[PDB]
């Protein structure tokens, strides 16, 4: 009444609100996803990490305060921003800004999962994930922002959102963890984004990499990336809930194995060579062979703990796995050939393997010295590093018949005459246009789905143009307007300029003209 009441101190904890969320939905005819999907099964599932808006914010803010304390206070006072081996500080221009776009697309993919979820609890869970992917976008941005302020070479840390557009490795990044998630079946994002992307590839990409950062003197990236991934346990769990629903309905389960294989191949096609190249060639001190990192995280642990366990319920080992394991052993070495040969189109400064690097490569990948090693050493002798040499290896490749092709589907470069990874060139004409495909899995995708795969490649856009003109047009220069952002060495002297590039007279061909 007006006098008597229980005055014991009480609040309301997040789980007390959460148990009512499922009842927030209501029925009406139009209450269904707006996006196309093959998956129409029942998906009334339960969230494994109960959260409400207020508690979501409390958790993430607590993570942030510790992260930004370490960065803006402790590590800045130590001068840690310039205690990084130049090879690794250059690598983080690419890793952080490329991951940034993956995170950004993950926002959009997570919104498709939000839209296609049928349970209020899952819609709630996917909004939290949508917010996390924004958090990760800003964390990746903050790493390059911090490097811009404290590292000895801010160029390229400070403008990748435009300078990345110059070069061919960026093209494949727009598919791997990007278009491949958001331009397709919305419910299928539970398979490609989550069961594969988040459950498999974020571990080597965001967690394992922090040990290479520390080895090379970078304590900024661990501070941030290790906090990024704390959010991923919610995301994996969201995805698994929908995977269970798919497996439990026979009409939905008949799509799962083909979607899984296509996701695994699509992602590994670029992830495997590009991150392995960045780890091993973009470092001085190496933690372990990339192929061992890949064996641990992708083949044994993800493969056994997720896919192998799900074999009990009809999920098949990806048929492309054999081709992928070959890529894990050699494809990053193939990619390094292209990366070093086309260095002027990037936004990072590269370092040819030194004598101890070469011994390490040969010890862990026998046969490396007689193939890749001899090529790098000959390029060095020709003046690879010297701005007065007039030497750029892409022209040298062409003069010896080592043409570079771009996969119409994955955008990954392919040098059939030098590659040891998986691949073989297929060139088709269709409706007056020539197309180059490079493997059995992507060739099928293009043959069945040509209207999904119309990506212009760098040779088509730049055909007949001289290299320095393309670089200048794309703002591939430092603040003086003439020294390139990209470099073929990591020293502070003898930096290459646009005029140094122009002297080589490198002009883009049409690699398919010969067919």
């Amino acid at each position: 009444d007006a006098l008597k009441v229980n005055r014991a101190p009480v609040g309301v904890e997040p789980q007390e609100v959460h148990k009512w969320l499922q009842s927030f939905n209501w029925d009406f005819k139009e209450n269904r996803t707006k996006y196309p999907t093959k998956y129409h099964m029942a998906n009334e599932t339960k969230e494994q990490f109960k959260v409400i808006a207020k508690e979501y914010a409390r958790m993430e803010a607590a993570k942030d305060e510790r992260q930004f304390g370490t960065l803006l206070d402790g590590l800045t006072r130590l001068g840690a921003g310039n205690k990084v081996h130049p090879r690794w500080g250059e690598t983080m221009k690419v890793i952080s800004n490329f991951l940034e776009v993956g995170e950004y697309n993950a926002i959009a993919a997570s919104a498709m999962l939000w839209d296609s979820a049928t349970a209020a609890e899952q819609k709630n869970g996917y909004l939290a994930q949508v917010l996390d992917e924004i958090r990760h976008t800003h964390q990746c941005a903050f790493i390059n922002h911090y490097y811009s302020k404290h590292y000895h070479d801010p160029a390229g840390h400070n403008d990748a959102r435009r300078t990345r557009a110059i070069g061919p490795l960026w093209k494949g990044m727009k598919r791997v963890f990007a278009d491949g998630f958001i331009s397709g079946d919305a419910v299928e994002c539970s398979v490609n984004l989550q069961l594969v992307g988040e459950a498999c590839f974020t571990n080597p990409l965001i967690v394992a990499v922090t040990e290479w950062a520390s080895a090379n003197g970078d304590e900024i990236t661990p501070t941030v990336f290790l906090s990024v991934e704390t959010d991923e346990l919610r995301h994996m769990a969201n995805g698994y809930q929908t995977v269970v629903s798919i497996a439990n309905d026979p009409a939905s389960a008949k799509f799962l194995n083909t979607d899984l294989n296509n996701a695994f191949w699509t992602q590994q096609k670029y992830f495997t060579p590009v991150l392995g190249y960045l780890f091993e060639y973009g470092s001085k001190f190496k933690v372990e062979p990339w192929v061992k990192t890949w064996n641990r995280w992708v083949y044994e642990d993800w493969g056994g703990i997720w896919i192998g366990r799900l074999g009990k319920y009809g999920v098949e080992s990806p048929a492309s796995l054999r081709d992928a394991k070959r890529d894990a052993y050699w494809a990053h070495h193939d990619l390094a050939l292209a990366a070093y040969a086309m260095w002027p189109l990037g936004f990072a400064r590269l370092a040819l393997p030194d004598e101890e690097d070469q011994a390490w490569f040969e010890a862990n990948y026998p046969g490396w010295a007689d193939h890749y090693g001899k090529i790098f050493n000959e390029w060095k002798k020709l003046g690879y590093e010297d701005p007065k040499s007039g030497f750029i290896p892409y022209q040298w490749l062409l003069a010896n018949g080592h043409d570079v092709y771009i996969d119409r589907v994955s955008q990954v470069p392919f040098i059939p005459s030098l590659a040891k990874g998986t691949g073989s060139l297929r060139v088709h004409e269709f409706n007056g246009k020539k197309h180059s495909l490079t493997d059995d899995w992507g060739e099928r995708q293009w043959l069945i789905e040509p209207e999904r795969y119309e990506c212009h490649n760098v040779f088509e856009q730049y055909e007949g143009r001289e290299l320095s003109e393309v670089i200048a047009e794309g703002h591939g220069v430092r603040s003086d307007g003439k020294t390139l952002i990209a470099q073929p060495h990591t020293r502070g002297d003898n930096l290459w300029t646009l005029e140094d590039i122009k002297r080589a007279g490198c002009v883009f061909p049409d690699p398919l003209a010969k067919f």
Binding site: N6, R7, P9, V10, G11, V12, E16, S23, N25, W26, F28, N31, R32, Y35, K54, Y56, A57, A61, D64, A80, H85, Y104, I107, A108, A111, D115, K123, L127, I134, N144, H145, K149, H152, D153, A155, N158, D159, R161, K171, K174, A178, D179, S183, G184, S214, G217, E219, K284, E288, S410, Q411, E451, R452, Y453, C455, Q461, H475, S479, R491, D493
Partner: protein, 392 residues
């Protein structure tokens, strides 16, 4: 010991730190240390908000404002692009122009909501210890607040989900951030209403905080018939992502939502002795104004005044407003039937009080939105249309 190498840190291990120091140049290789220095600043200096947000979206030159080139790497079956101009009727010379005036990237957003999260639980622990619920009007508490404020949570929940396709479809980074933060604030509102009901249940024997009665009212009570119809249309009836944000926040929530939250539950709480509900409406109303600042920038500063497409955009914005204002007026006409159930308070729940409340809501809306896009509105006519639903 362990099976794998204990990696030595380059920052602290003497040998690796010495090797690094020898490799690092004795001078910086450029002087431009401003992250994404080329962004066009909206304000007198480039903000950290802009630096961390702007151009994160990798749009090509054929989506207005994009700095990249060429087609997407992978498109939908049939050819729908990853992002595309087909996603909305509105046009602009640069989709990146939008700026949240609160300059919220993810960190300031969760920092602020974290403050509210923890202070809320301290307030509840003290409010329960205070015993202040003892002076609330029991009829208001049991028959109006529990039932019809509870039912209002479904409007907030629907507006939350209206953003799902916006988060996928919209065409720039600052817009995507604005939309997602608005969505969380809407689902927060719904969760906070349920939090208040669950809290009263711990203080008042017999008080039922189940959503059964609220849900029955939302789905079948005439008082919420028009509101639910509008929310259903904005959420699931369209996919033009600019239409959803405009209809949802700038028309429906700015008229019906503001009337319900502010003129009814917040205002009348302070006439019926309710010392609890104002703590909760304080949050929804703070969120509304923050969201409004960003919605206003997108549609007024950017789209309604875009140098090439301002008048074009106002043609669509005016047509949407005509439609959804009619829906919102109908929702309010249904809603004012609720006053037939409340105790009369002169100047608050009589015809004059309700008339003045509608004049504030429609009058403020004319100033805040209608005048800015050129939408002519007769405020008295809208007040009179809604009062046709008021039981004298």
């Amino acid at each position: 010991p362990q099976s794998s190498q204990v990696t030595k840190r380059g920052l602290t291990d003497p040998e690796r730190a010495a090797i690094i120091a020898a490799a690092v140049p004795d001078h910086a290789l450029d002087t431009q240390r401003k992250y994404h220095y080329f962004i066009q600043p909206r304000w007198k200096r480039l903000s950290e908000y802009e630096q961390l947000s702007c151009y994160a979206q990798p749009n090509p030159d054929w989506i207005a404002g994009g700095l990249d080139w060429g087609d997407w790497t992978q498109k939908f079956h049939g050819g729908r692009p990853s992002w595309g101009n087909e996603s909305t009727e509105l046009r602009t010379t640069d989709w990146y122009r939008h700026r949240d005036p609160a300059r919220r990237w993810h960190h300031p957003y969760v920092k602020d909501k974290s403050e509210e999260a923890r202070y809320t639980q301290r307030f509840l622990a003290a409010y329960s210890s205070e015993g202040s619920i003892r002076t609330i009007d029991p009829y208001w508490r049991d028959e109006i607040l529990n039932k019809y404020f509870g039912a209002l949570l479904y409007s907030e929940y629907g507006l939350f989900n209206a953003h799902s396709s916006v988060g996928r479809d919209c065409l720039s980074d600052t817009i995507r951030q604005t939309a997602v933060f608005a969505a969380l604030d809407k689902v927060d509102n719904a969760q906070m209403i349920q939090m208040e009901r669950l809290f009263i249940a711990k203080l008042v024997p017999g008080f039922d905080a189940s959503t059964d009665v609220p849900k029955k009212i939302w789905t079948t009570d005439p008082i919420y018939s028009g509101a639910r119809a509008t929310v259903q249309e904005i959420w699931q009836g369209v996919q033009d992502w600019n239409e959803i944000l405009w209809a949802g926040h700038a028309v429906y929530d700015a008229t019906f939502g503001q009337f319900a939250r502010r003129e009814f539950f917040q205002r009348l709480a302070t006439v019926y002795g309710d010392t609890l509900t104002p703590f909760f409406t304080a949050q929804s109303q703070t969120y509304f104004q923050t969201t409004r600042g960003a919605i206003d920038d997108l549609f007024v500063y950017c789209l309604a005044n875009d140098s090439e497409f301002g008048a074009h955009n106002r043609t669509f914005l005016n047509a949407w407003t005509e439609h959804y204002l009619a829906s919102s007026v109908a929702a309010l006409k249904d809603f004012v039937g609720l006053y037939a159930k409340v105790e009369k308070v002169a100047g608050a729940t009589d015809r004059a009080g309700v008339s003045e409340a509608l004049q504030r809501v429609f009058g403020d809306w004319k100033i805040d939105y209608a005048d800015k896009i050129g939408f002519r509105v007769d405020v008295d006519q809208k007040v009179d249309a809604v009062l046709a639903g008021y039981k004298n």
